[PDB]
Amino acid sequence: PTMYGEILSPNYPQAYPSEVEKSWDIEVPEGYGIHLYFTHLDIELSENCAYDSVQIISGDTEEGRLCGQRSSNNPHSPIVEEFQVPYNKLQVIFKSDFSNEERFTGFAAYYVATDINECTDFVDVPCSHFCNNFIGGYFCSCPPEYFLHDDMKNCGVNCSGDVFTALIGEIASPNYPKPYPENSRCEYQIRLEKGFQVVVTLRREDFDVEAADSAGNCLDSLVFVAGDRQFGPYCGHGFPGPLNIETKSNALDIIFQTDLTGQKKGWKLRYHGDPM
């Protein structure tokens, strides 16, 4: 694994021998591409470069097959041919046939590792918020009070952990009645004694979450989990479900999931305990 290197034809800068087949394997570290450029090219010319040729192979396709004699157009650069590959590995193959009718001094080439800008070089940006490119890689960052997920791609608000054991309580989405945060997963847990059952009540006007898509799928959703039984997912302007839910369980999980865009007022509910 190198950052730069040099590739010279056999016996350069003198003439190359006949019937030779030399190969070089070029490798730069991960997170880099390769800029390969020729500064000298003096090889026997033939149709399709069949006799003598220098070959460039990225992945396993052919980037190019060079032969003939060429000098640079610019006096500001000796580069005659150049290749830019988005891969970290490359192969160069030089071969010559049985005879040279003239003095052919072969070729001279150089390669340098080129940084990949993952934030711009691709169709999609691999970060929910801010993408930070550096040399040899990249990293994602988050706005204040947002934290990076284990996938190191998604940023989300910390709104999980609060366990409710009180027999009566109220629960609301973050910042209610101000808009809820985006790209977040909020988990609320209610734990009562055995003999009691969690019953959730809320007013219909106390629920405003982004509406479902054209296929009825909730992009933002609120769901109640009581073991195997399940209530939801709920979304839309106004609570579409029952305003009074007897969960038949002393333990209830409340999960509020939101995507990247489209936030609304949120929700506010009350729970209490009924006997079994």
Binding site: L45, S46, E47, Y51
Partner: peptide, 23 residues
């Protein structure tokens, strides 16, 4: 008028010679 085009590619490789003598 403009510069005449670059000369064409070189002709095909000549055929192999005849077989040789025997030491």
């Amino acid at each position: 008028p403009g510069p005449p085009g670059p000369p064409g590619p070189p002709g095909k490789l000549g055929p192999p010679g005849p077989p040789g003598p025997p030491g």
